[PDB]
Enzyme design. Structure first.
Site, short mmCIF file in Angstrom:
data_model
loop_
_atom_site.label_atom_id
_atom_site.label_comp_id
_atom_site.label_asym_id
_atom_site.label_seq_id
_atom_site.Cartn_x
_atom_site.Cartn_y
_atom_site.Cartn_z
N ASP A 77 -17.56 20.72 9.92
CA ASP A 77 -17.86 22.11 9.01
C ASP A 77 -18.59 21.23 7.89
O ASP A 77 -18.89 22.37 6.95
N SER A 106 -21.55 21.62 2.85
CA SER A 106 -20.12 21.84 2.99
C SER A 106 -20.47 23.26 3.39
O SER A 106 -20.53 24.31 2.78
N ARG A 107 -20.30 23.60 4.66
CA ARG A 107 -20.63 24.97 5.36
C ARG A 107 -19.69 26.01 4.80
O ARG A 107 -20.22 27.06 4.65
N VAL A 108 -18.63 25.84 4.84
CA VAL A 108 -17.37 26.79 4.20
C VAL A 108 -17.71 26.97 2.93
O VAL A 108 -17.66 28.21 2.42
#
Lengths: 203, 303, 120, 48, 265, 236, 116, 102, 100
Positions: free
Chosen positions: A43, A68-70
């Site tokens: 992720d 950081s996709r989140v």
């Protein structure tokens, strides 16, 4: 393997294993099968660049290849506020820097960026085996982003960081307690911090 | 038209387009669609060629468009690998050359004892990176007797057809060029050649010669644009090119090149449908026709 | 003859009569003239080739007849017809401001250009 | 002041119908700063 | 690895090539205007030179130099610096008034008895009489220019539209005019002080010429440099292209080895 | 989806995510099946498998199904065969670029790199086509001019070029519109803008009818009405 | 720096950074003259060219093969020597004086040799 | 002088050159032309070196020039592939190092 | 590029040395004969012959050496190690030929 790390619900006792994979890249070849596979699964990517290691960011994180996709939802509320345009500044710095090494007559806007950008990278610079408390990362990013350090000479940025923290520890230790305690920056706190930073511009 | 690996929806549009332009009544569409199996795909150009033999053998003429041999290759790859034959260069079967060559030599212009049959062919290869370096392009380029290499920049720059004429060649070329059109377009090749070279020094305007070239060249480039799915009659190709050769279009504004073209054609149709019919039947341009044409071009150019 | 020059175009190289405002008063030059150096003042200038006369408004410069019977004139900028009404009005306003405020030299020249234009 | 400063001022004054070419205006417009120097050591550059 | 490091550097080289190409072409456009100015100006100057010759003017020492603030205009900065250096063996302690930032750094190094007055901001601008006049006015006051029996000016004479030869000439002080004898075939009484006027006027008129000559040479140098750049970049493009091609072939060999391993199965 | 299309007869709007995973999965079971892998290890049956999926999804006379298939372009190289194979099968490609995202523009869609063959002039109507051609040219010019502005300088640009650049920066940030599901990823409520309204609004901009509006008052807002309103907000 | 001391580490840090810059500007140096690089950079380039040459040291075993009498230099001496060079103390004498020779004292002596 | 992978004509020119310079009387030529069978070419350097050792083991100083071992590599490659042993690095046999070192 | 006088001297020597390096295929040279030639170049006496004429110098020098004193070469033929006398003889001989 990787999907067995997760944040669980409170009817699952609010557990959470967090995972950090480490992948060696053979000549930085991310199109290699094992690197490709892992990138999809995860992720985020925290790309480390060798040239930047030599350039003096140690650890060095190539922020272009790091995602950081989140993203923020685990970033401190305060720290989100301050570092909001830190990304924009750095992105602009990257474009400007490419032009800058051809060192032609600079657009005023570009040399504003260049000067600010140079300080920002130096501000980021890490020192191996020495973490830093978030309560004391909030001031440094405030100072930098609010351009108080843009003026301050590149060489003595490293000195400045240490000293600024010491100065706040001495004088504005009440403020630091508040940043620790409340974790989001109030108007009063932002102003207090601004006044403190401004004072420390000339030391 | 040999639709290879083309989705049924695309071919449906193709069929529909052919019906729209009332071209179905001589068209044949041999279809191995995207869904159709790789063995069917393997035999699909072969099948198509066979249809062509009947026409060719009858001495008549026909045009077979193999579109695209690139998807033919992939099917052969799939087929070969499943038949456990080692894959050749760039993982495309070793005898892919042999396959492609067999197909492309089954197109021919027969002997006069064989009644001068014609099976024109026009294979289409799609270069996925624009790399003619790639093995399947290289092989085919060698086999073929000419190539047309369209360039992406030109397409983007709204030049349709997006042919990059520098990278287009014909190895049969002027043997099959209309005499009229040959006369009025030796110059055109040379003009465009200069225009291309002096386009890269126009980023500027310096020599009088370079700017003159640029005016002639830019107007010509604009002239050679064509809106897709409108064909053009040769008897109307030649006047337009003559104008450009004689540089009468130089004065005409770039934006107005298009307007000029259609107007000029209608003007030619009204004033001199004698010229058009003469061009059509003679197939060559007499001094009198080039004379008359110049007068007409000047007159139209004035308006 | 007259050789007249400016740093953007050299206006003359054979001119018949030249009328010049000089620190020797006013000078007229025709063909042969004994060789002098004369400062051209801020001026209303006439250059005549034949009887045809061209009238020039001049920021001063230098005149130097060379001993080959050519009047070499070099000056910063020249036309009079272009210079000549609202600009004279503006010059009057500007003169008033300039009067109070090197400031003296500026005001003297400002008055001179305004006057020389007013003469037109 | 200097004679050529007088002539300069006259050119500038002439740059004050009314309307004139860009080259005149450019010839009467300067973005330079005379930088007093010495030795290296420079008293601060002020506009020229 | 090889492949990516080749490609990224090759991309950099491509981008540089494109920028330098653009610059070179734009420089050519600009060069025409620069040269045009220099013709008219030079013609104007020659008329004055006609006097100086016939006067037989026969000129401490001042050095004035002309370059731009601007860079990437070839080797003007150091070639003019070099032609200065030869004549800075003719008085090391000579005070150099530098019109343009780039030459200044080099000369300042060659002697620190040089830069006393400098003029910054001429480099961006085109040759203009007003600038020359203000510089002259400051030269007289600041450097006491008339006091020095010699003045020497340095510039780059734009020999051909592809060349520049660094050049100098002597500016004649009011003292010089006085004691030159064949000044007497020209006339003035005492109504004007022609030495004191003519010196000042030719201080600017000569200076403007030097500036015009320089400006054309600067733009010419920039054109020349950016052309040579395109060549140097091309060579690197080709070298990395061959490397790219070799690297590509090798990968295909590795892939064929993988397929051959599958054949072994 | 077939059940919906066919037997429930209705239109659908299929969504698949991410089809590179469909390729990867297939590559794996090809190798497990022992089939000799093709280029960049991808299954020898790649084409026909992709084909089977893609062909199955289509507008019939029984119904209509509108697929949106996500594709992950590994290491942003679409010359890699798996994206390229899919590239053929899909009608209306859209390219999302990291750079554009980094510039702070969300949508991250790079307009000049996205290509939709539904942008045919007749299909969208001549006005839409012409406006969009003008937009495309304007932006492409701006991109070309980015190099000149950066190094050579902003000031050497022509008056015409400068107006094109100024409009392009406004257009660039007029693209920036907020997304309702990025009230979570931002906070600004999204805007659904009518097709007609978009055509109209871009036309206006090109004419420079709103060149009296700040650049940042185009940034991250919806329609023209919003852009005008945000001009007032910035003014305040 | 917890091992070989902060001062040692700092000296090494500067060497690495300088050389990395030098490697970085290798492209630019070729396309555009090294003269046409920034003043700050030219100092760096000159320093780096010196550093590169400085890194040399004839071997004792291969004193024969090199043909130069071997050089073996103390670690304590090395840190000191580089520190000085980084402070540009000995930056004022030939680049070739740093080439294929040992310690700083030797460089000074080789300057005398070159001077003749 | 070991001539490996060379045209029989070219070798004959070499021989004639050597005999023109009358050098043949002190030299041996071993020849393994391109036409000659690929395994024979593989065994060609080894065999030549045996001859050299007889001179060496007379305690007499000698020289052997192996022109070109690159053609021995291609030969060994052919042999290896035809022995259906998996290709080594760069598709040259995996025992190619051993071949040369021995 | 700016070439320091130190580098320029080296370049001037280097280029002249490069000329000295060259050989003509199928012409082998005596070891003895190579000794004076290398002495000359090392001791920089090939400054004394402009680069174009270096080849002429070499052949002429060899003819000179044999005619002037083949004694030196005979000595190097047997001794195979230079002595002070040989070293001086080479300095003397090289300067002498270089001059002419």
């Amino acid at each position: 393997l990787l999907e067995r790390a997760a944040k669980l619900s409170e009817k699952e006792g609010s557990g959470s294993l967090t995972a950090l994979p480490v992948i060696e890249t053979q000549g930085g070849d991310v199109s290699a099968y094992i690197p490709t596979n892992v990138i999809s699964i995860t992720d985020g990517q925290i790309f480390l660049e060798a040239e930047l290691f030599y350039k003096g960011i140690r650890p060095a994180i190539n922020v272009g290849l790091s995602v950081s996709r989140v993203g923020s939802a685990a970033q401190v509320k305060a720290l989100k506020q301050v570092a909001g345009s830190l990304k924009l500044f750095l992105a602009q710095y990257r474009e400007v820097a490419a032009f800058a090494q051809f060192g032609s007559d600079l657009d005023a806007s570009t040399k504003q960026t260049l000067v600010r950008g140079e300080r920002l990278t130096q501000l980021l610079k890490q020192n191996q085996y020495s973490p830093l408390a978030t309560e004391e990362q909030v001031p440094l990013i405030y100072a930098g982003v609010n351009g108080h350090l843009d003026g301050i000479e590149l060489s003595r940025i490293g000195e400045f960081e240490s000293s600024f923290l010491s100065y706040l520890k001495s004088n504005h230790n009440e403020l630091l307690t508040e940043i620790r305690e409340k974790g989001e920056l109030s108007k009063e706190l932002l102003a207090s911090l601004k006044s403190a930073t401004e004072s420390f511009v000339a030391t | 038209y040999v639709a290879v690996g083309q989705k049924r929806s695309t071919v449906a549009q193709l069929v529909q387009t052919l019906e729209q332009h009332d071209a179905m009544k001589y068209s044949i569409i041999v279809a191995a669609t995207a869904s159709e199996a790789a063995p069917l795909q393997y035999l699909a150009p072969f099948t198509a060629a066979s249809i062509g033999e009947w026409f060719r053998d009858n001495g008549k003429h026909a045009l077979i468009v193999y579109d695209d041999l690139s998807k033919q290759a992939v099917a052969y790859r799939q087929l070969s690998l499943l038949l456990r034959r080692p894959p050749g260069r760039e993982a495309y079967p070793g005898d892919v050359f042999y396959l492609h060559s067999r197909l492309l030599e089954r197109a021919a212009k027969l002997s006069e004892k064989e009644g001068s049959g014609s099976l024109t062919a026009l294979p289409v290869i799609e270069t996925q990176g624009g790399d003619v370096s790639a093995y399947i392009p290289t092989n085919v380029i060698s086999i073929t007797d000419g190539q047309i290499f369209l360039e992406a920049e030109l397409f983007y720059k709204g030049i349709r057809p997006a042919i990059n004429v520098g990278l287009s060649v014909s190895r049969v070329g002027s043997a099959a060029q209309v005499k009229a059109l040959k006369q009025v377009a030796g110059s055109l090749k040379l003009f465009l050649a200069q225009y291309r070279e002096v386009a890269a020094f126009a980023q500027s305007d310096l020599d009088a010669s370079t700017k003159q070239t640029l005016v002639r060249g830019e107007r010509l480039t604009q002239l050679l644009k064509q809106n897709q799915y409108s064909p053009l009659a040769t008897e109307e190709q030649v006047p337009l090119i003559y104008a450009g050769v004689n540089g009468h279009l130089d004065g005409i504004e770039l934006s107005r090149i298009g307007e000029f073209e259609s107007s000029f054609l209608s003007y030619l149709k009204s004033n001199h449908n004698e010229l058009l019919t003469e061009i059509r039947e003679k197939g060559e341009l007499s001094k009198e026709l080039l004379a008359s044409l110049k007068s007409a071009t000047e007159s139209f150019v004035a308006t | 003859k007259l050789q007249f020059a400016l740093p953007h175009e050299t206006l003359y190289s054979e001119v018949t009569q030249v009328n010049l405002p000089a620190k020797s008063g006013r000078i007229g030059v025709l063909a042969n003239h004994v060789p002098t150096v004369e400062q051209l003042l801020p001026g209303v200038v006439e250059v005549m080739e034949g009887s045809n006369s061209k009238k020039f408004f001049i920021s001063g410069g230098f005149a130097t007849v060379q001993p080959d019977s050519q009047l070499c004139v070099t000056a910063i900028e020249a036309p009079l017809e272009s210079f000549s009404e609202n600009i004279k009005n503006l010059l009057a306003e500007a003169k008033k401001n300039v009067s109070s405020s090197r400031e003296a030299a500026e005001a003297a020249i400002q008055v001179e250009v305004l006057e020389n234009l007013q003469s037109v | 002041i200097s004679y050529a400063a007088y002539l300069n001022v006259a050119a500038q004054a002439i740059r004050s119908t009314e309307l004139q070419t860009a080259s005149v205006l450019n010839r009467s417009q300067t973005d330079a700063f005379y930088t007093q120097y010495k030795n290296a050591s420079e008293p601060t550059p002020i506009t020229k | 690895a090889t492949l990516k490091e080749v490609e990224m550097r090759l991309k950099s080289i491509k981008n540089i090539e494109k920028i330098t190409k653009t610059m070179k072409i734009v420089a050519s456009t600009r060069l025409s205007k620069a040269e045009k100015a220099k013709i008219s100006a030079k013609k104007m100057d020659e008329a004055e030179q006609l006097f100086y010759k016939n006067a037989e003017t026969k000129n401490k020492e001042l050095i004035v130099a002309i370059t731009s603030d601007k860079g990437l205009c070839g080797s003007i900065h150091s070639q003019l610096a070099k032609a200065v250096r030869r004549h800075l063996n003719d008085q090391p302690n000579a005070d150099i008034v530098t019109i343009g930032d780039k030459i200044k750094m080099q000369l300042l190094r060659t002697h620190p008895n040089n830069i006393k007055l400098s003029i910054n901001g001429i480099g961006k601008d085109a040759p203009t009489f007003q600038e020359s006049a203000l510089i002259a006015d400051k030269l007289l006051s600041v450097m006491k220019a008339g006091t020095y029996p010699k003045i020497s000016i340095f510039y780059n004479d734009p020999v051909s539209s592809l060349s520049f030869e660094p050049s100098e000439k002597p500016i004649f002080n009011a003292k010089t005019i006085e004691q030159s004898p064949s000044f007497g075939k020209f006339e003035i009484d005492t109504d004007a002080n022609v030495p004191r006027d003519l010196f000042e006027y030719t201080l600017a008129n000569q200076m403007l010429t030097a500036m015009a000559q320089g400006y054309a040479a600067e733009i010419s140098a920039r054109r020349n440099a950016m052309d040579n750049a395109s060549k140097n970049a091309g060579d690197m493009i080709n070298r990395y292209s061959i490397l790219y091609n070799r690297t590509r072939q090798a990968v295909i060999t590795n892939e064929l080895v993988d397929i051959i391993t599958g054949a072994s199965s | 989806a077939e059940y919906f299309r066919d037997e429930e007869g209705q239109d659908v709007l299929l969504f698949i995510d991410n089809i590179f995973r469909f390729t990867q999965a297939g590559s794996e079971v090809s190798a497990l099946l022992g089939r000799i892998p093709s280029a960049v290890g991808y299954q020898p049956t790649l084409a026909t498998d992709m084909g089977l999926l893609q062909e199955r999804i289509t507008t019939t006379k029984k119904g209509s199904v509108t697929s949106v298939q996500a594709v992950y372009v590994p290491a942003d190289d679409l010359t890699d065969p798996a994206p390229a194979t899919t590239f053929a099968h899909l009608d209306a490609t859209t390219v999302l670029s990291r750079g554009i995202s980094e510039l702070g523009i969300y949508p991250a869609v790079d307009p000049l790199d996205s290509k939709s063959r539904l942008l045919d002039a007749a299909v969208v109507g001549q006005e839409h086509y012409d406006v969009a051609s003008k937009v495309q040219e304007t932006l492409q010019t701006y991109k070309s001019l980015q190099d000149i502005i950066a190094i050579l300088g902003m000031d050497e640009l022509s008056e015409q070029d400068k107006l094109t650049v100024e409009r392009a920066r406004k257009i660039q940030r007029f693209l920036s519109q907020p997304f309702a599901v990025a009230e979570v990823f931002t906070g600004i409520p999204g805007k659904l803008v009518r097709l007609k309204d978009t055509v109209a609004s871009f036309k206006a901009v090109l004419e420079g009818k709103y060149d009296n509006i700040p650049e940042h008052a185009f940034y991250m807002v919806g329609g023209i009405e919003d852009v005008v309103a945000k001009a007032e907000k910035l003014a305040a």
